[PDB]
Paper text:
BV associates non-covalently to each SFP monomer in a ZZZssa conformation and is stabilized by aromatic stacking, hydrophobic interactions, and water-mediated H-bonding inside the lipocalin-like beta-barrel fold of SFP. The binding of BV induces tetramerization of SFP via interaction between amino acid residues from adjacent monomeric subunits. Using a combination of designed site-directed mutations, X-ray crystallography, UV/VIS, and resonance Raman spectroscopy, we have identified multiple conformations of BV that are stabilized in the binding pocket of SFP.
Two mutations – L135E (from interface 1) and [name] (from interface 2) stayed monomers on binding to BV as identified by size-exclusion chromatography profiles. Mutating these hydrophobic residues into polar/charged residues disrupted the binding interface. The purified L135E and [name] variants of SFP (the BV-bound monomeric variants) showed a distinct blue-green coloration (ESI Fig. S1†) under physiological conditions, unlike wild-type protein that appears deep-blue in color. The absorbance spectra of BV-bound [name] and L135E show maxima at 380 nm and an attenuated red-shifted broad peak at the far-red wavelengths (∼680–700 nm) compared to the wild-type protein, where the red-absorbance is at 630 nm. The [name] and L135E mutations showed an order of magnitude reduction, with fluorescence quantum yields of 0.003 and 0.0025, respectively (for excitation at 630 nm). Loss of oligomerization created a vacant space in the monomer near the open/wider end of the barrel, exposing BV to an aqueous environment at the site of dimerization. The conformation of BV is ZZZsss in the variants compared to ZZZssa in wild-type SFP. However, in the monomeric forms, the orientation of the D-ring of BV is stabilized by interactions with the A-ring of BV (the D-ring moves closer to the A-ring of BV) and stacking interactions with the Y142 side chain (which rotates to stack with the D-ring). In the [name] structure, water molecules occupy the original space vacated by the reoriented side-chains of F55 and Y142.
Residue numbers in the entry: 20 to 185
Write the structure that this text describes.
Amino acid sequence: MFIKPGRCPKPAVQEDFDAARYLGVWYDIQRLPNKFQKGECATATYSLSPGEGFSVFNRERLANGTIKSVIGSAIAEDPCEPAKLQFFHENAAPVPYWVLSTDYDNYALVYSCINLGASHAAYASIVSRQPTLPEETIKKLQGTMSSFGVGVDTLLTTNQDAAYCS
Ligand SMILES: C=CC1=C(C)/C(=C/c2[nH]c(/C=C3N=C(/C=C4\NC(=O)C(C)=C4C=C)C(C)=C\3CCC(=O)O)c(CCC(=O)O)c2C)NC1=O
């Protein structure tokens, strides 16, 4: 279903966010169950764009062994708030992409809440520069998540095993 009652929180974001340090490959460690991501081995690649934002290439492996991917764009509508991006894909309405925390080199926590009148749709990933992330880092980030109405108990652990994902 993925539609949940109540409207979105406005969590705090990475205040000093440098999109240039955020570029390259990020691996999905944990994610909320959502509509689009039906697979495993989920990676996001962020690329140089002429403009203010960056180009997005998201990639996953489905249960039948097929690779499915999407291209989009992430751009901060307010350069006072550079961690509040909007994600543009296809014909779609932009969805928020909020970097709540990153050290650029190890981890990020990303959130997107879509308001649907009285209900909402939430995306939340813990990502890593590696296919794994220390259980301490995941605990801290899960801690941030619980503080704005995400249930850590809903989080999928993403399969990043080279034997399936190669
Ligand atoms: C928390 C933020 C977050 C947002 C804003 C989000 C949105 C989002 N992810 C999508 C696809 C996707 N999203 C991902 C992966 C990712 N997406 C990411 O933002 C990140 C960090 C990864 C993983 C590292 C994948 C693999 C797809 C393709 C799904 C498919 O087509 O099978 C789509 C397009 C749907 C489509 O056309 O199929 C949207 C709008 N998902 C998220 O996780």
